[PDB]
C-alpha cells in the first residue's frame, strides 16, 4: 500500500500487542459462536473453600468453515509490515511498509499442527523466542503443504511419502540450529492434558483428538502408502481461553468431513544436560498465541 525507503525498523515478534489483541477477539468469537451446554471455571477467591462457578445454557449445534479474519489499526496507531521474504521476527528490516489491515487469517483452534495457514515463500523456516531454552515453543513453517483428511468415523489420513519428505526438511533445518553433527529424533508427546498429547482440533463443530505417535517416530542423519491416525470425538473439553471445563452435546451428523492443509508445526525440544549428542523433538502447542504469532511475526503496531 505505502512503501518506505531509507528507513530502518526494529521488530520484536515475541513482544507484539497485535498477538494479545487478536487472542481476545478470537476467544470472544468462539465463545459466542459455539456455546457449551455446561461451563465450569474455578473460583478460589476465599482463603479456604474453593467455589466452582457453573453455567448452564441452551446449546444449539453449529458448524461452518471459519471465515478469514483481519487485524486493522485502532484509532491512533499504524501497522508496519516487513517485506523480507525470510524474516526471523527480530532485528532491523529496511524493506518495510505500512498497511491498513493485515492479510486474511483463519482463526483455527488446534494443537501440534497448524492448519490452513501461510506457507514460507522459499525454504522451510523454524522460529523460537529462545532456542537454548527447552521450555519455549518451536514454530515450524513449511514451504509445501501436506493434506490431512479426517472423518467423524474415527480417523485422519496423511500420505506417508509426503510426510516423510517434510520431516527430512525439518530435521535438516533443526540440525543447522543445534549443531551440524547432531542426530535428529522425533518422539511422541511426553504427557499432559488430552488437548496437548493428541493432535487436537475443531471440525464441523466437533472437537477431534488424534493420536499423532505415528507422525513422530523417526531418527535422522544417524512401508504403507498412507498414515492413518486413530481419532476420538469428545464432549467434555478443557478450556483454552482460560482454566476450566466445558461440555457439549453429542454429534447429530453422520458425515463429518475435514480436509485441511498442514502448513506448520509446533514443537518442543527435550534438552537437558546430556553429553550424548542428539536432540529430541515432540509435538507441542496449547497456547494459541503461538498459533497467532506464526502469522503475525512480520507485523508491528506503532503510534502515529
Amino acid at each position, epitope marked *: 500500500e505505502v512503501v518506505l525507503v531509507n528507513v530502518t525498523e526494529n521488530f520484536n515478534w515475541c513482544k507484539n500487542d497485535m498477538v494479545e489483541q487478536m487472542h481476545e477477539d478470537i476467544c470472544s468469537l468462539w465463545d459466542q459462536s459455539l456455546k457449551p*451446554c455446561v461451563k465450569l471455571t474455578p473460583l478460589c477467591v476465599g482463603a479456604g473453600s474453593c467455589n466452582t462457578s457453573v453455567i448452564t445454557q441452551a446449546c444449539p449445534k453449529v458448524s461452518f468453515e471459519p471465515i478469514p479474519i483481519h487485524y486493522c489499526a485502532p484509532a491512533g496507531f499504524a501497522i508496519l509490515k516487513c517485506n523480507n521474504k525470510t524474516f526471523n521476527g527480530t532485528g532491523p528490516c529496511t524493506n518495510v511498509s505500512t498497511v491498513q489491515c493485515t492479510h486474511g487469517i483463519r482463526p483455527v483452534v488446534s494443537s501440534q499442527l497448524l492448519l490452513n495457514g501461510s506457507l514460507a515463500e522459499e525454504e522451510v523456516v523454524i522460529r523460537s523466542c529462545n532456542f537454548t531454552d527447552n521450555a519455549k515453543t518451536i514454530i515450524v513453517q513449511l514451504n509445501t503443504s501436506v493434506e490431512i483428511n479426517c472423518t467423524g468415523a474415527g480417523h485422519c489420513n496423511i500420505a506417508r511419502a509426503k510426510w516423510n519428505n517434510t520431516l527430512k526438511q525439518i530435521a535438516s533445518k533443526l540440525r543447522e540450529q543445534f549443531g551440524n553433527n547432531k542426530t535428529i529424533i522425533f518422539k511422541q508427546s511426553s504427557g499432559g492434558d488430552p488437548e496437548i498429547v493428541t493432535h487436537w482440533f475443531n471440525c464441523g463443530g466437533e472437537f477431534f483428538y488424534c493420536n499423532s505417535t505415528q507422525l513422530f517416530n523417526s531418527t535422522w542423519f544417524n512401508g504403507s502408502d498412507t498414515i492413518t491416525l486413530p481419532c476420538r470425538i469428545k464432549q467434555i473439553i478443557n478450556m483454552w481461553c482460560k482454566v476450566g471445563k466445558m*461440555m457439549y452435546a453429542p454429534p447429530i451428523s453422520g458425515q463429518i468431513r475435514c480436509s485441511s492443509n498442514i502448513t506448520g508445526l509446533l514443537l518442543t525440544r527435550d534438552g537437558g544436560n546430556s553429553n550424548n549428542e542428539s536432540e529430541i523433538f515432540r509435538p507441542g502447542g496449547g497456547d494459541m498465541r503461538d498459533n497467532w504469532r506464526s502469522e503475525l511475526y512480520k507485523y508491528k503496531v506503532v503510534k502515529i
Partner: antibody
Amino acid sequence: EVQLVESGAEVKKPGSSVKVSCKASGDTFIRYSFTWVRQAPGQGLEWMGRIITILDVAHYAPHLQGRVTITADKSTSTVYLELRNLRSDDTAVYFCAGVYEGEADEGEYDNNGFLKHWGQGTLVTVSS
Amino acid sequence: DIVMTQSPATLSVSPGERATLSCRASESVSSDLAWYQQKPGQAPRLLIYGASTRATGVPARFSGSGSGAEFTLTISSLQSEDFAVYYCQQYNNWPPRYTFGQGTRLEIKR
C-alpha cells in the same frame, strides 16, 4: 451393571429436612449420571433432578428449585438427596435411578435422559 | 413446561391380545421419549428409549414408535406379567426439565 441400594424409611414432621442416600456398586461410578424421581401414594412419577456425577453439576425441577440438593461422594460411590422445608405433600416414595453415559473419564459423554437402573425406593412420610 | 398426557387412563385387554398405548406431548420432543413399566410396590422398569429402542432384557412383543409430539407403545400379545401401569417420559429439553405422563393402567378383561 450397577446395583442401587437406598437407605431406610424416614418419618419427619413438616418443616423438617431429610437426607436420603443411594449406594451404587458394580461398575465405574463416574461413568453414570444419577436422577431422583418421587411418587406420592396413588399418584404418578415426578422427576426431581439429575446430577452429572463426573462434573459434579446438578439440575432441578422448577417447582422444587431452592429447597432440594443432589450430591455425590466419589470415594464411597454414594448419591444423596436432600429435601428442605418439608411439607405434608412431600410424603412419597423416593426413587434413586441412573444410566451409563459412556467413557466419561475420557471425555465421552452422551447425556442420556432415560433411567435404566433403579433402587428399591425409600418411603418418606411427612406428618404431624 | 412440556406436558405429557397418556390415553386412555385405563385399558382392559383380554389375555393374549394386542394392546396399544399412546403418549402425546404439548410440543415436539423429537425422539427423546421413553416408556416405563411399573407393578404395585416395585420400582419402575425401563422398556423403550429413543422412541423405539428396546432395553436389555426386554421381550420382542414390546415395541415403540413415533416422533415429535406423537408416540405409541405396542404389546402384540399380552402375557400375565404384562398387565401393569405404563409411564412415558420426555427428556428433550435443556436445561433439563424432564417430565412424565400420568400413566395408563393396563388390566385384564374378563
